[PDB]
């Protein structure tokens, strides 16, 4: 089918202008949209691409850490086994570490190397991916982080209409930086983004990616192809076979990513990405204020509590900082918000009638400005409010959290911990309250 290989969402910048134009960034935030490609980007704003060459990283922070996946080079769009007997799902990636020195040494002596053997199934030759570079550290990298806020607001890293802003604290990679430093097939296997939030990716160049895109709404589909492959379809490496996608009819994007093109993945988009040549990439995520992100958020936040992954991005945190903070005049997005914050109060207040009943003391211990949410030490779900820390990390004041299901696991009648409290209820019953829908004519 025709509408298997569907036409990439592409906009073609010219100037800056065009970058400031509002349609773009509704455009972009469009449900109906999977994938934006807004191409020329880069030039339309004149943004120094050089800041993030390899050469000005090495000069900058050359002792810098670098996360290395070590990775086959595979053929084009496929992935084989190690063998080349079969194509399959399962994506070979080892982990290591290096330093932005040592990598940038090796992706210019590989670039020597293939120009020399030009000049000159399997088996596969092994290639090194640098990934997940750190730069939120402002100290280290002030001209780098000064040059992306001349990006319209709606895709920058920091931005009163971004959700990520609204957390209060640093979610290190999606309200953060992060660089990318590769090599011809280096392989970001498929994934959707932490609690399915939009994210910007800019390909510094010199070479092109190529990107595949699955819509959202087909994830469950490529769930099954995983678990029936025996992967783990948010913790493992996995490589989709587009024969096998083809098969099952669900419509794959495909597009090339050119140096200066910036990337936007909408909500829960499906993707893998590979590089075609020599470059360097940064992205960050960003949360539009719309009811489709907080909507496959909350969503992807619930599933992970079933699968035992840990959610970067705190929602229960999120949802009263929107209520305390943001006017909100989507009646759909308001109706969300107003529901899960309904569903914390109606726990919490449950909970801790049921501690108050069984005569366990509910300890006043109040909060610092800008402190971080919390999650549990032993399982990782998020913790609000209500805080179970042992006698002894009480005592030490290390406080260490642990939700009331892991608490309760280890000390049956919770007779080895105490119960600390960071709000009143009164606080947060107002804070409901007062959160009603804005009038907006927009
Ligand atoms: O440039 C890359 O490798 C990436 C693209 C999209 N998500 C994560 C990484
Ligand atoms: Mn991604
Ligand atoms: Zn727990």
């Given at each position: 089918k025709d509408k298997l290989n569907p036409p990439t969402p592409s906009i073609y910048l010219e100037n800056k202008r065009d970058a400031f134009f509002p349609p773009l960034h509704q455009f972009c935030t469009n449900?109906?949209?999977p994938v934006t490609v807004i191409r020329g980007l880069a030039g339309a704003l004149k943004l120094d691409l050089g800041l993030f060459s390899t050469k000005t990283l090495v000069e900058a922070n050359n002792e810098h850490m670098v996360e290395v996946r070590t990775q086959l080079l595979q053929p084009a769009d496929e992935n084989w086994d190690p063998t080349g007997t079969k194509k399959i799902w399962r994506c070979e990636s080892n982990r290591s570490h290096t330093t932005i020195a040592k990598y940038a040494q090796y992706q210019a002596s590989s670039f020597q190397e293939s120009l020399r053997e030009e000049n000159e199934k399997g088996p596969f030759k092994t290639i090194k991916f640098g990934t997940?570079?750190?730069?939120?550290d402002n100290k280290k990298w002030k001209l780098q982080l000064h040059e992306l806020t001349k990006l319209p607001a709606f895709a920058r890293?920091?931005?009163?209409?971004?959700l990520l802003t609204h957390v209060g604290h640093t979610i290190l990679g999606m309200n953060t930086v992060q660089l990318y430093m590769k090599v011809p097939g280096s392989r970001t296997p498929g994934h959707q983004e932490n609690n399915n939030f939009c994210s910007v990716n800019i390909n510094i160049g010199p070479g092109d990616c190529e990107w595949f895109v699955v819509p959202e709404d087909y994830w469950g589909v490529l769930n099954d192809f995983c678990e029936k492959n025996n992967?783990?379809?948010?913790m493992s490496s996995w490589w989709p076979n587009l024969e096998d996608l083809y098969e099952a009819n669900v419509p794959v994007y495909r597009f090339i990513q050119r140096p200066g093109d910036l990337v936007w993945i909408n909500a829960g988009t499906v993707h893998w990405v590979q590089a075609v040549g020599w470059c360097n990439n940064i992205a960050w995520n960003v949360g539009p204020l719309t009811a489709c992100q907080y909507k496959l958020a909350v969503e992807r936040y619930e599933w992970n509590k079933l699968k035992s992954v840990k959610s970067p991005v705190p929602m229960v945190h999120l949802s009263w900082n929107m209520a305390r903070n943001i006017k909100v005049s989507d009646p759909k997005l308001f109706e969300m918000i107003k529901y899960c914050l309904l569903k914390i109060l109606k726990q919490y207040q449950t909970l801790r009638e049921a501690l108050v009943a069984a005569g366990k003391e509910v300890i006043w211990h109040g909060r610092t400005n800008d402190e971080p949410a919390h999650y549990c030490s032993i399982c990782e779900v998020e913790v609000f409010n209500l805080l179970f820390v042992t006698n002894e990390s009480n005592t030490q004041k290390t406080y260490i959290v642990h939700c009331h299901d892991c608490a309760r696991k280890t000390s049956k009648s919770l007779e080895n911990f105490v119960v600390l409290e960071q709000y009143k209820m009164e606080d947060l019953i107002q804070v409901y309250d007062q959160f009603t829908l804005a009038l907006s004519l927009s």
């Open positions: 449900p109906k949209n997940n570079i750190d730069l939120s890293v920091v931005s009163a209409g971004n992967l783990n379809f948010l």
